[PDB]
């Protein structure tokens, strides 16, 4: 027997490796009812790349739970939270401007940033990598992409840090999360009244139906977006590959590589481990028969690590066949920054491995969030030379 499955309220040190803990419900059995009740609704969580696949692209599970605070208003028109209607309209207002074109040619200034993170991260004894290099270089993108001083970034980011407090995938919290709310909505409305921002602004300047506070909620996300998930990439890609130096090593020799070795490093440890649907009609899973209303989580580190699809999951092998792993997901909620998420995965990737010659020798301090969803280190130290 195995415990009830819950993404919360898990130990410690299974958060710091949570593979093994799939691979026993997986082997277990490919979906795992977790019920409520009665009064329900029951969760099925899912830990096959088929299933999970399956739930990633059933138009019948959708985001929000259909019935079978500055911090409310920022958070209502978040892409991330809106089903196919509401979505389909926003999805399609920014996806060319996060178009591989805009991405490219942003390349060289995201470089620029991780370089400049790095010459600082260089005067410390023992630096800490999160909140000097990969919990900054996601906020400082995103923030010339929206023109926002530089100099905010550390502002900026510890509001965002602020705002995760109030995440349904953690535990006076709403407190911290509504001040920081509150702060980001004077800062960005301050900022509508003066580059992504501007063409958001001019698009209601000229006849386009866009709400202050839309445009407002919009930049909220944006900003926090890689701050929970790039950041986590990039302190556990650090960890991944100081426990394979064999890759490490070939990727400090290898330059061309560092592309192959970021899908590779996300398919072994993606930073967002699940994402939840709600079933809009009765549906077979597994050996299943889901109700309709019931709560589907797709697990997708679970998934990315399925020896169904990926033989010998637990090898770190940049030769597998690309685009297999589901870490920005699968579908029309398809990751919408996955491009530029990329791009600073790899230019942050190869500025640290060009930066820090010892970055895979001595040892390291390293602490967890305790968040089962938006999964990475709070902290990650490391033993310079
Ligand atoms: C490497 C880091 C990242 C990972 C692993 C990741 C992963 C994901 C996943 C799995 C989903 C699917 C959610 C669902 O099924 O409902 C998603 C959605 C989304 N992501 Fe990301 N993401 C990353 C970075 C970013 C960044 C940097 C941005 C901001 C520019 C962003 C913006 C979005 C948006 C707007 C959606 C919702 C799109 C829709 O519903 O159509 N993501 N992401």
Same mark, same amino acid.
């Given at each position: 027997t195995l415990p009830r499955f819950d993404?919360?309220?898990?130990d410690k040190k299974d958060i710091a490796d949570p593979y093994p803990v799939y691979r026993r419900y997986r082997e277990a059995a490919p979906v795992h009812r977790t019920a409520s009740g009665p009064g329900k609704p029951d969760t099925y969580y899912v830990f096959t790349y088929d299933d999970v696949v399956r739930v990633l692209s059933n138009?019948? /599970?959708?985001?929000? @739970?259909?019935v079978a605070r500055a911090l409310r208003t920022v958070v209502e028109?978040? /892409?991330?939270? /809106? #089903?196919?209607?509401?979505?389909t309209e926003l999805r399609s207002l920014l996806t060319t401007e996060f178009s591989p074109s805009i991405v490219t040619g942003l390349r060289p200034r995201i470089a620029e940033l991780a370089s400049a993170l790095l010459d600082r991260l260089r005067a410390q004894r023992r630096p800490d990598l999160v909140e000097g290099f990969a919990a900054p270089l996601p906020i400082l993108v995103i923030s010339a992409l929206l023109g &926002? %001083? *530089? *100099?905010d970034h550390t502002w900026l980011r510890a509001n965002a840090v602020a705002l995760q *407090? @109030?995440?349904?995938?953690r535990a006076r919290g709403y407190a911290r999360a509504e001040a920081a709310s509150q702060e980001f909505t004077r800062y960005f409305r301050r900022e509508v009244d003066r580059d992504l921002l501007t063409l958001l602004v001019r698009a209601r300047d000229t006849?386009? %139906? /866009?709400?202050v506070d839309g445009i407002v909620g919009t930049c909220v996300h944006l900003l926090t977006a890689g701050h929970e998930t790039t950041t986590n990439f990039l302190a556990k890609a650090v960890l991944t590959l100081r426990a394979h130096r064999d890759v490490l090593d070939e990727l400090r020799t290898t330059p061309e590589s560092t592309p192959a070795a970021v899908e590779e490093l996300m398919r072994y #440890?993606?930073?967002?481990?699940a994402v939840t649907r709600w079933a809009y009609e009765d549906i077979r899973l597994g050996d299943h028969d889901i109700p309709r209303g019931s709560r589907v989580v797709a697990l997708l580190g679970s998934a990315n690590r399925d020896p169904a699809r990926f033989? #010998?999951?637990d090898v770190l092998d940049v030769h597998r066949a690309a685009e297999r792993q589901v870490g920005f997901g699968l =579908? &029309?909620?398809?990751?919408? =920054?996955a491009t530029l998420a990329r791009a600073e995965a790899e230019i942050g990737l190869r500025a640290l491995l060009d930066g820090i %010659? @010892?970055?895979?020798r001595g040892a390291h301090e390293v602490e967890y969030a #305790?968040?089962?969803?938006?999964? =990475?280190?709070?902290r990650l130290l490391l033993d310079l030379p």
């Amino acid at each position: 027997t195995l415990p009830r499955f819950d993404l919360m309220g898990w130990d410690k040190k299974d958060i710091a490796d949570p593979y093994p803990v799939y691979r026993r419900y997986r082997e277990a059995a490919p979906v795992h009812r977790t019920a409520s009740g009665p009064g329900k609704p029951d969760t099925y969580y899912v830990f096959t790349y088929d299933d999970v696949v399956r739930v990633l692209s059933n138009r019948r /599970l959708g985001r929000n @739970a259909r019935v079978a605070r500055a911090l409310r208003t920022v958070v209502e028109n978040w /892409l991330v939270f /809106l #089903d196919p209607p509401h979505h389909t309209e926003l999805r399609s207002l920014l996806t060319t401007e996060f178009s591989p074109s805009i991405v490219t040619g942003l390349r060289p200034r995201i470089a620029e940033l991780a370089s400049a993170l790095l010459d600082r991260l260089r005067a410390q004894r023992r630096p800490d990598l999160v909140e000097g290099f990969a919990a900054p270089l996601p906020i400082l993108v995103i923030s010339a992409l929206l023109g &926002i %001083p *530089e *100099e905010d970034h550390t502002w900026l980011r510890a509001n965002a840090v602020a705002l995760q *407090e @109030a995440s349904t995938t953690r535990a006076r919290g709403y407190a911290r999360a509504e001040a920081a709310s509150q702060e980001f909505t004077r800062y960005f409305r301050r900022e509508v009244d003066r580059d992504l921002l501007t063409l958001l602004v001019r698009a209601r300047d000229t006849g386009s %139906p /866009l709400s202050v506070d839309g445009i407002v909620g919009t930049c909220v996300h944006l900003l926090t977006a890689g701050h929970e998930t790039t950041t986590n990439f990039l302190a556990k890609a650090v960890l991944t590959l100081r426990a394979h130096r064999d890759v490490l090593d070939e990727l400090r020799t290898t330059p061309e590589s560092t592309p192959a070795a970021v899908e590779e490093l996300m398919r072994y #440890d993606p930073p967002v481990q699940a994402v939840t649907r709600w079933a809009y009609e009765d549906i077979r899973l597994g050996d299943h028969d889901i109700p309709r209303g019931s709560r589907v989580v797709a697990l997708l580190g679970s998934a990315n690590r399925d020896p169904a699809r990926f033989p #010998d999951p637990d090898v770190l092998d940049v030769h597998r066949a690309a685009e297999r792993q589901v870490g920005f997901g699968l =579908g &029309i909620h398809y990751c919408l =920054g996955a491009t530029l998420a990329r791009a600073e995965a790899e230019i942050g990737l190869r500025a640290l491995l060009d930066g820090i %010659p @010892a970055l895979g020798r001595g040892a390291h301090e390293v602490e967890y969030a #305790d968040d089962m969803v938006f999964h =990475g280190p709070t902290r990650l130290l490391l033993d310079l030379p």
